[PDB]
Amino acid sequence: ENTLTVKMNDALSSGTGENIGEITVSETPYGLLFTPHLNGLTPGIHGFHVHTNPSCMPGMKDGKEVPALMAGGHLDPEKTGKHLGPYNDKGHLGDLPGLVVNADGTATYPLLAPRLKSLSELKGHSLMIHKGGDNYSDKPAPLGGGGARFACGVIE
Amino acid sequence: ENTLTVKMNDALSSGTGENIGEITVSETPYGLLFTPHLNGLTPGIHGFHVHTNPSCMPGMKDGKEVPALMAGGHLDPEKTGKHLGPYNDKGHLGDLPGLVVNADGTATYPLLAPRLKSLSELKGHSLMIHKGGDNYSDKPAPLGGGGARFACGVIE
Ligand SMILES: [Cu+2]
Ligand SMILES: [Cu+2]
Ligand SMILES: [Zn+2]
Ligand SMILES: [Zn+2]
Known part of the structure; x- marks a missing residue:
């Protein structure tokens, strides 16, 4: 098979x-294919990115608790400093296609990230799902307008 | 840049x-990126494919009208006879990712077809959108269970 399974949890x-x-x-x-089997999300498109750190823990920023802050920012080993999506090599390597949530709050539609080659x-x-x-x-x-971190999962 | 714009109409x-x-x-x-700017669709995921003929004309089959019958079948230059989707090269080259329609009936989510390289x-x-x-x-x-043809556009 050669697959990864990432458990996703709401971030508080x-x-x-x-x-x-x-x-x-x-x-x-x-490229890498992300096939979700999720429920409990608001219908629509959600920002979906690989973040740098292997943590989903919340942390403090400017005196306020921030859900999943400890994951850090979008994965960006090339130091582009730019968010340009999954089809543009001038931005964050961690930028994945938007996560598609169905009317019933489930996510099932598979997402191809062609800039990523290997698990x-x-x-x-x-992995981060934004509001x-x-x-x-x-x-x-x-x-991209992703705003707050809604759910997260650590890879390894 | 090198773009194509395909006007899409309902098929009756x-x-x-x-x-x-x-x-x-x-x-x-x-690969080729298909960026919809559509309205008037049923929310959800719709079969989305390139069909062989440059026609959206209707026809009759077994005594029942078939919208956009004259488009023919899925684009299949290799004669696979197999519908396997956009990530499997043993199938119709015309097989694109499912078209994502928002709750308000618009389609805006970009769709990457990595098997197609040139306009x-x-x-x-x-181009065909199924019910x-x-x-x-x-x-x-x-x-793929896409069933009847809901909307169609000719490329050239
Ligand atoms: Cu993110
Ligand atoms: Cu079709
Ligand atoms: Zn980014
Ligand atoms: Zn097909």
Whole structure:
């Protein structure tokens, strides 16, 4: 098989919340395929990124608890400093296609990330689902408009 | 840049229906990107494929009208006879990822077809949106379970 299974949990101010399912990651000739099996999300498109650190723990920023802050920022080993989505090599390597949530709150639609080649590249990082969407740009809102971190899972 | 814009219209038993927008196809290093700007669709995931003929004309089969019958079958230059989706090269080259329709009936989520490399592979063909979904296989239903043709656009 050669797959990874990532358990995803809601992210709260105090710590980890409810489990919402798993994402199965597989290798294809065209890149990594993220097949979700999730529930408990708001219907629509959600920002979906690999973050640098292997943690989903909440942390303090400017005096306020921030869910899943300890995952750090979007995975960016090339130091692009730019959020440009899964089809643009000028931005964060961790930028994945938006996560598609169905009307019934489940996520099932598989997502191809063609800039990622090997499951090894995900180990030691985290997967993040944001409250908002992802227009694959830093404008008009930074980081695609994803906003707050809703659910997260550590890879390894 | 090198783009194609495909106007899409509803396909009725009696012919061409209302315009529902356009799909813009761009070339990327990862394959052709299909960026919809559509309205008027049922929320959910819709079968989305390139069909062989540059026609959206209707026809009759077994005494029942078939919207956009004259588009023919899925684009299949290798004569696979197999519907296996956008990530499997043993199948119809015309097999694209499912088209994602938002709760408000619009389609905006970009769709990457990594098996297609050049817009020239599309010239002289048609784009089709089905009523049903697409499980990227011929089981339990042929052609992914997309069923009837809901909307159609000719490429050249
Ligand atoms: Cu993120
Ligand atoms: Cu079709
Ligand atoms: Zn990013
Ligand atoms: Zn097909």
